[PDB]
Design an enzyme around this catalytic site. Sequence first.
Site, short mmCIF file in Angstrom:
data_model
loop_
_atom_site.label_atom_id
_atom_site.label_comp_id
_atom_site.label_asym_id
_atom_site.label_seq_id
_atom_site.Cartn_x
_atom_site.Cartn_y
_atom_site.Cartn_z
N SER A 75 -0.58 15.53 -12.18
CA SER A 75 -0.84 15.16 -13.56
C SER A 75 -1.07 16.42 -14.39
CB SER A 75 -2.04 14.21 -13.62
OG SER A 75 -2.46 13.95 -14.95
N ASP A 133 0.83 -1.20 0.00
CA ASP A 133 0.00 0.00 0.00
C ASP A 133 0.87 1.25 0.00
OD1 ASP A 133 -1.92 1.92 0.30
OD2 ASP A 133 -2.43 1.40 2.39
#
EC number: 3.4.23.22
Length: 330
Positions: A199, A35
């Site tokens: 992004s 994770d």
Amino acid sequence: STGSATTTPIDSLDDAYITPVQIGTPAQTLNLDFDTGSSDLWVFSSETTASEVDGQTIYTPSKSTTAKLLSGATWSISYGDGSSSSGDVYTDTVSVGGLTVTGQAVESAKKVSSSFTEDSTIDGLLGLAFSTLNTVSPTQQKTFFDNAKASLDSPVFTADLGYHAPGTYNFGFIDTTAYTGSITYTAVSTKQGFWEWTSTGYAVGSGTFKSTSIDGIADTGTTLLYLPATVVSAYWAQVSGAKSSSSVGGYVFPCSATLPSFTFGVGSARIVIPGDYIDFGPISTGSSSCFGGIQSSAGIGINIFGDVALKAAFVVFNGATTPTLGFASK
């Protein structure tokens, strides 16, 4: 040193991935959920409340000659999905794919929430976010990667998650045969303890690319892709009959639909998520309403590039002095 381990979807939907991890001496192998959005290595154990164990493999520290109680240490964690766990702490030897760390903090669960109990395939979590998020008190502990880093050939790990198939976590090297083209690196902020990056935009299907900054985290422990409501609405508007359902808890779509791809930007590069990756199947057995793999982050407080996004790429988690993230097509 290096390590390399195969990671395997837990079910036919790729809801999560499990990776075998050797703990203790002799080794006890548990299948852990790696994770990159948390920083605790915790396991089902001989200390876990019996009614809360249902099929998981447990770590029994009393059977490990290298286990030592970390005196006074406790831990307690709550995850974004509302699940939680807590307990006490041992140090022990932990190996992943041939890479060994001695003195790793292994957090033994005394209590786990129902969602963990109900998932027989996940024996615990191995956190790979920054150690500043580790919950051990009163002395915070380091992640497996943080402990291994100085010994690694290069201070990196990579995630290569499969679509409906196994993939690989590598530590200490970049497998140049595992991706196509080049790896595009992008800046990381560690301010919130995550692999947080920005992004450069998105496209829906064959549509034009929208240049827009989207801050979010690379999180292997989250199944879906969570993005701003504007972006998510633009995606589902291209699927006839798709709608946001408050009762179901997100966007659903007719199972008869063909889903468009979704592209996200990494610098000037582009990662394409095929439409099929966005299908999470019937909302309930036999339903013709299917659950979407792109959902709104509104009210989470952060955008999350979960498995839906990451499995479309070869992803480098670069833990150099100034961390960065790399993405390649594959």
